Amino acid sequence: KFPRVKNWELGSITYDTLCAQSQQDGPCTPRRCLGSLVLPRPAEQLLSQARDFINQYYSSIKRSGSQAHEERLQEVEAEVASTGTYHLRESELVFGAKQAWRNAPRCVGRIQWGKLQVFDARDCSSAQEMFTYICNHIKYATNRGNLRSAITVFPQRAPGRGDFRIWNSQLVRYAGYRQQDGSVRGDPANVEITELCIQHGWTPGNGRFDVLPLLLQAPDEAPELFVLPPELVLEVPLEHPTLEWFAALGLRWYALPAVSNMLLEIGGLEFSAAPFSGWYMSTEIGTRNLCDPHRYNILEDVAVCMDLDTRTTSSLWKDKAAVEINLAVLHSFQLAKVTIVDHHAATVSFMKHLDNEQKARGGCPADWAWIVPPISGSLTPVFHQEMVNYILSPAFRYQPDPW
Amino acid sequence: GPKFPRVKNWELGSITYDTLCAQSQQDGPCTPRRCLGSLVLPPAEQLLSQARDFINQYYSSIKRSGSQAHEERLQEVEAEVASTGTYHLRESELVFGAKQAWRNAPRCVGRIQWGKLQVFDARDCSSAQEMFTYICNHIKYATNRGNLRSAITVFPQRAPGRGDFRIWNSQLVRYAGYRQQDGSVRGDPANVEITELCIQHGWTPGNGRFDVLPLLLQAPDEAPELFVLPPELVLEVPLEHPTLEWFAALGLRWYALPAVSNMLLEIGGLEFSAAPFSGWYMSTEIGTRNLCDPHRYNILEDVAVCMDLDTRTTSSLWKDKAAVEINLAVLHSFQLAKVTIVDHHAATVSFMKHLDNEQKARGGCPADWAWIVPPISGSLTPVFHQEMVNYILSPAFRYQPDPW
Ligand code: HEM
Ligand code: HEM
Ligand SMILES: CNCCN(C)c1cccc(CCc2cc(C)cc(N)n2)c1
Ligand SMILES: CNCCN(C)c1cccc(CCc2cc(C)cc(N)n2)c1
Ligand SMILES: CNCCN(C)c1cccc(CCc2cc(C)cc(N)n2)c1
Ligand SMILES: C[C@H](O)[C@H](O)[C@H]1CNc2nc(N)[nH]c(=O)c2N1
Ligand SMILES: C[C@H](O)[C@H](O)[C@H]1CNc2nc(N)[nH]c(=O)c2N1
Ligand SMILES: [Zn+2]
């Protein structure tokens, strides 16, 4: 059986046949669906994943079954047979990284998947050198506000040794300072990493938007501390198009969303340090980062400034304040000439991506709970679109924290 | 550690384990290879086991498992089955089963109320005219002049050989949907087919945006008959806004009573093909889905124009702004009219309380995240941050094929 997928707004129906190429089990079983869960609970194997990936690569360049194709499988086989592992050509790696983004079910930004600048950093042997590559990435990706998607790929994992790792979950994070009286100053999501930085010698600040340093780790060594040159970290001060007092709140966010703690798996090789960046969708900053109860939690403050009735839920003060905060983010980013996409625009393009992918591959892995935005869900077309979630390789995956 | 699904709340950081799912006797649409959780719609020896299971559920609920009465009722049920092929529920078993079906419904956010359900037994009903009297009674009792009371009316069970009782309409209250020559729809496009069915069966149609449909009621092996609800039994709330004076001029309205009439109620293998149930609305159902879905009333652009918003670009957030005010109008207008309603914040907070109750009482709660999280302001509600486990328990409300 192939899943019958329906759009309830338009009445149209597709069949996902791509899921048959899934070689990895998810968390669901016939007895119960575990879809809303955020986190998960041999030479022949490697060789098999290598052959299958090499076959995808040569299929992608219309040279499948050719001579260069067969010699490449020969190479891979020979290298694994002798050393237990192998290595990718740079052009293969580039193909692999784009394909991993393309396959990421939780990503609403995949219309962009073919446009990705890939920096090969596999020739890196120290934390200092990682830092050099990281600064290059940030400088390129940021491009004075004209953001460009990029990934930098550090050396693959090896059986013999510890991993290359970036300890920070993103290249840019605001410190979270735990007070003696339980509360948090700054970003509460970053309390643990803030404390790790301090322990490793960083002189902390006392602000709510203190850009953290990076903890970079070369294999089997203590991580090293590197401060990002403040001119490389582009930030956008937040104001509101019609609410003059909003700017007073001193709110701000950084331009570059660059995830640095996921593992990139291509053809069985694993890249434990491979930071990637694109550009923000406004709800990430406006709704989640600023309004989550366990993040900056600014909803009530903004509601009070707007003079809303905050004593009852039925006045929708939360809904009203959230919309103004999101609007302030879009306004501010557009004012600063920094790329951002609103959730209506983002989801319309994802619908186009679904149709592209339906034609190119016969389906598209999508995580509904993650694709539908955190405000105004049914106001976007993805809400009305059934989706099929499953795991394809190449893939980005979670990995354990290196401490 | 524990060999059951681990469930995390990401706002609070707390963990539970769902052991209730072990009790699931029916498989959903998911497999290890792919998740189909976002899809809306993916006997003799059999009957006995389902029956035995339900009777065990019943005797546990009254804390008498293993007792003399428990084993006698088991013998009583398998006796009746062996000699007829089916069996009858005691009254109190029906009341238990109906409640348990609601308690078990994964897509329902209102389940904190589950123990408070008035069950009207109508298993004696023997005509379509009689079904109508029962339905009127339900509506009268449940509406209660605006102070809504949850209720279900249970009509006769499927009987081997004999045809089903069916209410053709999807709800007891439904606005007509009149397809136009230009291909558009006047009224509710959700109800185009049932509207045409009513006409085909001799209803004289109106031409408004809010014409209350007649009921098509079908007794065993008979053609359905048409029944017009007396307008004084159908409570409606005109929609106005607390500060935007022009909103009332839009002439929008909604009915007080959400009463679902097309689901099958399954208890212990017995099937009640007509068993309409009603509660009260969550405001987002009306304010967001029914009024702003593009394939429903689709008034978002109308309202945004009245609010003088820039509808030419997505990034003005005109949709979001307009949706918020429409939802506000629904709440304000129901409150003014003294008609029970619950906003999505109060509703989701109470659902979180329900999850905690069920965690202690049953070791879990089957829940469908995509349906539990509201259609506006998702992450502003606590359920967005709550992982959920979805599975099918019985007694249950189930979808059944349309009778035509
Ligand atoms: C170009 C603009 C992009 C936009 C607007 C975008 C948007 C998003 C959003 C909103 C999420 C949900 C994140 C959250 O709520 O925490 C997400 C997830 C994700 N993104 Fe994209 N993204 C973009 C580019 C990229 C790129 C360039 C990559 C990698 C090459 C990527 C890989 C991923 C992955 C793997 C996830 C899922 C993470 C997980 O499973 O936890 N994205 N994206
Ligand atoms: C008392 C207040 C109640 C509230 C606020 C409430 C709320 C809701 C909401 C918002 C939905 C989502 C439906 C949709 O989006 O179309 C729903 C679904 C559902 N409700 Fe409740 N409900 C209530 C009472 C009841 C009662 C009394 C019953 C039965 C005795 C019931 C059974 C169900 C079932 C079976 C579903 C899911 C049906 C499906 O799968 O489509 N509800 N409810
Ligand atoms: C732990 N779960 C989520 C945190 N991680 C690892 C994660 C992964 C992917 C995306 C995000 C949100 C940040 C982000 C990244 C990119 C590339 C684009 C974008 N708009 N946002 C965060
Ligand atoms: C509300 N009506 C059902 C009450 N119950 C459970 C009930 C009523 C009368 C008799 C019985 C005994 C079971 C039984 C056996 C046989 C041969 C026929 C029958 N109708 N019921 C059970
Ligand atoms: C696709 N699923 C729709 C099935 N139907 C008709 C259905 C079932 C249950 C609930 C609803 C929404 C209407 C409703 C009913 C009740 C009892 C309470 C409430 N707040 N809303 C609709
Ligand atoms: C429990 C639930 O799955 C969790 O809160 C998810 C819901 N959907 C999400 N969607 C996005 N884009 N990002 C998130 O962090 C989450 N969180
Ligand atoms: C495709 C998707 O599952 C579908 O649009 C669902 C999403 N969640 C929902 N949630 C509720 N409460 N009601 C609905 O009708 C839907 N529709
Ligand atoms: Zn699933």
Coordinates of C-alpha atoms in Angstrom, one line a residue, chain B residues 29-376:
Chain B
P29 CA -2.6 3.9 10.2
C30 CA 1.1 4.2 11.2
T31 CA 4.0 1.8 10.7
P32 CA 7.8 2.0 11.5
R33 CA 8.5 3.0 7.9
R34 CA 6.1 6.0 7.7
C35 CA 3.9 8.3 9.9
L36 CA 0.3 8.9 8.7
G37 CA -0.7 10.9 11.7
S38 CA -1.8 14.0 9.8
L39 CA -4.4 12.1 7.7
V40 CA -8.0 13.0 8.5
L41 CA -9.4 9.6 7.4
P42 CA -6.6 7.1 6.5
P43 CA -19.1 -12.0 13.7
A44 CA -19.6 -14.5 16.5
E45 CA -16.2 -15.1 18.1
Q46 CA -15.2 -11.5 17.4
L47 CA -18.3 -10.0 19.1
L48 CA -17.9 -12.1 22.2
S49 CA -14.3 -11.0 22.9
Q50 CA -15.2 -7.3 22.4
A51 CA -18.2 -7.8 24.7
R52 CA -16.2 -9.6 27.3
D53 CA -13.6 -6.8 27.3
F54 CA -16.3 -4.1 27.6
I55 CA -18.0 -5.9 30.5
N56 CA -14.6 -6.1 32.3
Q57 CA -14.2 -2.4 31.7
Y58 CA -17.6 -1.9 33.3
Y59 CA -16.9 -4.0 36.4
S60 CA -13.6 -2.2 37.0
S61 CA -15.3 1.2 36.7
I62 CA -17.5 0.2 39.6
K63 CA -14.6 -1.6 41.4
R64 CA -16.1 -5.1 41.2
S65 CA -13.7 -7.1 38.9
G66 CA -13.8 -10.8 39.6
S67 CA -17.0 -10.6 41.6
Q68 CA -20.0 -12.9 41.4
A69 CA -22.1 -10.3 39.5
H70 CA -19.2 -9.7 37.0
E71 CA -18.9 -13.4 36.1
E72 CA -22.7 -13.7 35.9
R73 CA -23.0 -10.8 33.5
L74 CA -20.3 -12.4 31.4
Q75 CA -22.3 -15.7 31.3
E76 CA -25.4 -13.6 30.7
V77 CA -23.8 -11.9 27.6
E78 CA -22.4 -15.1 26.0
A79 CA -25.7 -16.9 26.7
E80 CA -27.7 -14.2 24.8
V81 CA -25.0 -14.1 22.0
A82 CA -25.0 -17.9 21.5
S83 CA -28.8 -17.9 21.3
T84 CA -29.3 -14.8 19.2
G85 CA -26.0 -13.7 17.7
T86 CA -26.1 -10.4 19.5
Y87 CA -26.8 -9.0 23.0
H88 CA -28.3 -6.0 24.9
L89 CA -26.6 -3.5 27.2
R90 CA -28.0 -2.8 30.6
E91 CA -28.9 0.9 31.0
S92 CA -25.9 1.7 33.3
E93 CA -23.6 -0.1 30.9
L94 CA -24.8 2.2 28.1
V95 CA -24.3 5.3 30.2
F96 CA -20.7 4.0 31.1
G97 CA -20.0 3.2 27.4
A98 CA -21.1 6.5 26.0
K99 CA -19.0 8.4 28.6
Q100 CA -16.0 6.2 28.0
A101 CA -16.3 6.7 24.2
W102 CA -16.0 10.5 24.7
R103 CA -13.2 10.0 27.2
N104 CA -11.4 7.9 24.6
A105 CA -11.8 10.4 21.6
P106 CA -8.2 11.5 20.7
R107 CA -9.3 14.6 18.7
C108 CA -11.5 16.1 21.4
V109 CA -10.0 18.9 23.5
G110 CA -13.1 19.2 25.7
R111 CA -12.6 15.9 27.5
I112 CA -12.2 17.4 31.0
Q113 CA -16.0 17.4 30.9
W114 CA -16.2 13.7 30.0
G115 CA -17.8 12.5 33.3
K116 CA -20.6 15.1 32.9
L117 CA -22.7 13.8 30.0
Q118 CA -26.4 13.3 30.0
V119 CA -27.3 10.0 28.3
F120 CA -30.8 9.8 26.8
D121 CA -31.7 6.2 26.1
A122 CA -33.7 6.0 22.9
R123 CA -33.1 2.3 22.1
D124 CA -36.9 1.9 22.0
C125 CA -37.3 4.3 19.0
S126 CA -39.3 2.7 16.1
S127 CA -40.0 5.4 13.5
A128 CA -38.4 8.4 11.8
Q129 CA -41.1 10.6 13.3
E130 CA -40.2 9.2 16.7
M131 CA -36.4 9.9 16.0
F132 CA -37.5 13.6 15.5
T133 CA -39.3 13.9 18.9
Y134 CA -36.1 12.4 20.5
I135 CA -33.9 14.9 18.6
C136 CA -36.1 17.8 19.6
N137 CA -36.0 16.8 23.2
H138 CA -32.2 16.5 23.0
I139 CA -31.9 20.0 21.5
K140 CA -34.2 21.5 24.0
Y141 CA -32.5 19.9 27.0
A142 CA -28.9 20.5 25.7
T143 CA -29.5 24.1 24.6
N144 CA -31.1 25.0 28.0
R145 CA -31.8 28.6 26.9
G146 CA -28.0 29.2 26.4
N147 CA -26.6 27.4 29.4
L148 CA -25.5 24.5 27.4
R149 CA -25.4 20.9 28.9
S150 CA -23.5 18.1 27.3
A151 CA -25.7 15.3 26.1
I152 CA -26.1 12.2 23.8
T153 CA -29.2 10.5 22.6
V154 CA -28.7 6.8 21.7
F155 CA -31.0 5.2 19.1
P156 CA -31.4 1.4 18.5
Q157 CA -28.3 -0.7 17.8
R158 CA -27.5 -2.3 14.4
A159 CA -29.4 -5.5 14.3
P160 CA -28.5 -8.4 12.0
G161 CA -30.9 -8.6 9.0
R162 CA -32.6 -5.3 9.7
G163 CA -31.5 -1.9 8.3
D164 CA -29.8 0.9 10.3
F165 CA -31.1 3.9 12.0
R166 CA -29.3 6.9 10.5
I167 CA -29.3 10.6 10.7
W168 CA -28.2 11.7 7.2
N169 CA -27.0 15.2 8.3
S170 CA -23.5 15.6 9.8
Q171 CA -24.8 17.9 12.5
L172 CA -28.3 18.5 13.9
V173 CA -27.7 22.2 13.0
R174 CA -26.2 23.0 9.6
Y175 CA -26.5 26.1 7.3
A176 CA -27.5 25.5 3.7
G177 CA -25.0 25.6 0.9
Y178 CA -26.5 26.7 -2.4
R179 CA -24.2 26.2 -5.5
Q180 CA -24.5 29.1 -8.0
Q181 CA -24.5 29.4 -11.8
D182 CA -21.1 31.0 -11.6
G183 CA -19.9 28.0 -9.7
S184 CA -19.7 29.7 -6.4
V185 CA -21.6 28.9 -3.2
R186 CA -24.1 30.8 -1.2
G187 CA -24.0 29.8 2.5
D188 CA -21.7 27.1 3.9
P189 CA -19.8 25.2 1.2
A190 CA -19.2 22.3 3.7
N191 CA -22.9 21.5 3.3
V192 CA -23.5 21.5 -0.4
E193 CA -24.1 17.8 -0.8
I194 CA -26.5 17.5 2.2
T195 CA -28.3 20.6 0.9
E196 CA -28.9 19.0 -2.5
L197 CA -29.9 15.8 -0.8
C198 CA -32.6 17.7 1.1
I199 CA -33.9 19.2 -2.1
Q200 CA -33.9 15.9 -3.9
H201 CA -36.1 14.6 -1.0
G202 CA -38.5 17.5 -1.5
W203 CA -37.2 20.4 0.6
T204 CA -38.1 23.8 -0.7
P205 CA -34.7 25.6 -0.5
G206 CA -34.2 29.2 0.6
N207 CA -31.5 31.6 -0.6
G208 CA -29.7 33.1 2.4
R209 CA -26.2 32.6 3.8
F210 CA -27.6 31.1 6.9
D211 CA -30.6 28.9 6.1
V212 CA -31.0 26.2 8.8
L213 CA -31.3 22.8 7.0
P214 CA -34.1 20.3 7.6
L215 CA -33.2 16.9 9.0
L216 CA -33.1 13.7 6.9
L217 CA -34.0 10.9 9.3
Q218 CA -33.9 7.3 8.3
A219 CA -35.6 4.4 10.1
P220 CA -34.8 0.7 9.3
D221 CA -35.2 -0.2 5.7
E222 CA -37.2 2.9 4.9
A223 CA -36.4 6.0 2.7
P224 CA -35.3 8.9 4.9
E225 CA -38.0 11.4 5.9
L226 CA -37.6 15.1 6.1
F227 CA -38.1 17.1 9.3
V228 CA -38.0 20.9 9.8
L229 CA -36.7 22.1 13.2
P230 CA -39.0 24.7 14.7
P231 CA -36.9 27.9 14.6
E232 CA -37.5 28.6 18.3
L233 CA -35.6 25.4 19.2
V234 CA -32.6 26.5 17.2
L235 CA -30.7 29.1 19.3
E236 CA -28.5 31.5 17.3
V237 CA -26.1 34.3 18.2
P238 CA -25.7 37.4 16.0
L239 CA -22.1 38.4 15.7
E240 CA -20.9 41.8 16.8
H241 CA -17.5 43.1 17.9
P242 CA -16.8 44.9 21.2
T243 CA -15.2 48.0 19.6
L244 CA -15.5 47.8 15.8
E245 CA -19.0 49.1 15.3
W246 CA -19.2 48.0 11.7
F247 CA -18.8 44.3 12.4
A248 CA -22.5 43.9 13.3
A249 CA -23.4 45.3 9.9
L250 CA -21.8 42.2 8.3
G251 CA -24.9 40.2 9.4
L252 CA -22.8 37.2 10.4
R253 CA -24.1 34.6 13.0
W254 CA -23.7 31.1 14.3
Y255 CA -25.8 28.5 16.1
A256 CA -25.3 27.8 19.8
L257 CA -25.4 24.0 19.7
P258 CA -22.6 21.8 18.2
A259 CA -24.4 18.5 17.9
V260 CA -22.6 15.8 15.8
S261 CA -25.0 13.4 14.2
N262 CA -23.2 11.2 11.7
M263 CA -20.8 9.2 13.9
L264 CA -21.1 5.5 14.9
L265 CA -20.9 4.8 18.6
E266 CA -19.3 1.5 19.3
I267 CA -19.6 -0.2 22.7
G268 CA -18.6 -3.8 23.3
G269 CA -18.9 -4.7 19.7
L270 CA -22.4 -3.4 19.5
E271 CA -22.9 -0.6 17.0
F272 CA -25.1 2.5 17.5
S273 CA -25.3 4.0 14.0
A274 CA -27.4 6.9 15.2
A275 CA -26.3 8.4 18.4
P276 CA -26.0 12.2 18.1
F277 CA -24.0 14.0 20.8
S278 CA -23.6 17.7 21.7
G279 CA -21.4 19.9 23.9
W280 CA -20.5 23.6 23.6
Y281 CA -18.2 25.4 21.1
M282 CA -14.6 26.3 21.4
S283 CA -14.5 29.8 19.9
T284 CA -11.8 28.9 17.3
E285 CA -14.2 26.4 15.7
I286 CA -16.5 29.2 14.6
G287 CA -14.1 32.2 14.5
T288 CA -11.3 30.5 12.6
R289 CA -12.4 27.4 10.8
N290 CA -16.0 28.0 9.9
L291 CA -15.7 31.7 9.2
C292 CA -12.1 32.0 7.8
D293 CA -11.3 28.6 6.0
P294 CA -11.0 29.4 2.3
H295 CA -13.4 26.6 1.5
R296 CA -16.0 27.7 4.2
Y297 CA -17.4 31.2 4.7
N298 CA -14.0 32.7 3.7
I299 CA -14.7 36.2 5.2
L300 CA -11.1 37.1 6.0
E301 CA -10.6 39.4 3.1
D302 CA -14.0 41.1 3.7
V303 CA -13.1 41.8 7.3
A304 CA -9.6 43.0 6.5
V305 CA -11.0 45.5 4.0
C306 CA -13.3 46.8 6.7
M307 CA -10.3 47.1 9.1
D308 CA -8.4 49.1 6.4
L309 CA -5.5 46.6 6.3
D310 CA -3.0 46.1 3.4
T311 CA -4.3 42.9 1.8
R312 CA -1.8 43.3 -1.1
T313 CA 1.1 41.7 0.8
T314 CA 1.4 38.7 3.1
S315 CA 3.9 40.5 5.4
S316 CA 1.4 43.1 6.7
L317 CA -0.1 40.1 8.7
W318 CA -3.6 41.2 7.6
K319 CA -4.9 37.7 7.8
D320 CA -3.6 37.2 11.3
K321 CA -5.0 40.6 12.5
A322 CA -8.4 39.9 10.9
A323 CA -8.6 36.4 12.3
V324 CA -7.9 37.6 15.8
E325 CA -10.8 40.2 15.6
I326 CA -13.3 37.7 14.2
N327 CA -12.5 35.3 17.0
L328 CA -12.9 38.2 19.5
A329 CA -16.3 38.9 18.0
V330 CA -17.4 35.3 18.4
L331 CA -16.4 35.3 22.1
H332 CA -17.9 38.7 22.9
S333 CA -21.1 37.9 21.1
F334 CA -21.7 34.5 22.8
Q335 CA -20.9 36.1 26.2
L336 CA -23.3 38.9 25.6
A337 CA -26.0 36.4 24.5
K338 CA -25.3 34.3 27.7
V339 CA -24.5 31.3 25.5
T340 CA -21.8 28.9 26.8
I341 CA -18.6 29.1 24.8
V342 CA -14.9 28.5 25.6
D343 CA -11.9 30.3 24.2
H344 CA -8.9 28.3 22.9
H345 CA -6.7 29.4 25.9
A346 CA -9.1 28.3 28.6
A347 CA -9.9 25.1 26.7
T348 CA -6.3 24.0 26.3
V349 CA -5.4 24.8 29.9
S350 CA -8.3 22.6 30.9
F351 CA -7.1 19.9 28.6
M352 CA -3.7 19.9 30.3
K353 CA -5.6 19.3 33.6
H354 CA -7.4 16.4 31.9
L355 CA -4.0 14.9 30.8
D356 CA -2.8 15.0 34.4
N357 CA -6.1 13.5 35.7
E358 CA -5.9 10.6 33.1
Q359 CA -2.2 10.1 33.8
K360 CA -3.0 9.2 37.4
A361 CA -6.4 7.5 36.6
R362 CA -5.4 5.3 33.5
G363 CA -1.7 5.8 33.0
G364 CA -2.1 7.9 29.9
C365 CA -4.5 9.6 27.4
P366 CA -4.8 9.0 23.7
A367 CA -4.5 12.3 22.0
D368 CA -4.2 13.7 18.4
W369 CA -1.8 16.7 18.6
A370 CA -2.7 18.1 15.1
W371 CA -6.4 18.3 16.2
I372 CA -5.8 19.3 19.9
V373 CA -3.6 22.3 19.1
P374 CA -5.9 25.3 18.1
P375 CA -5.9 26.7 14.5
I376 CA -4.8 30.1 15.6

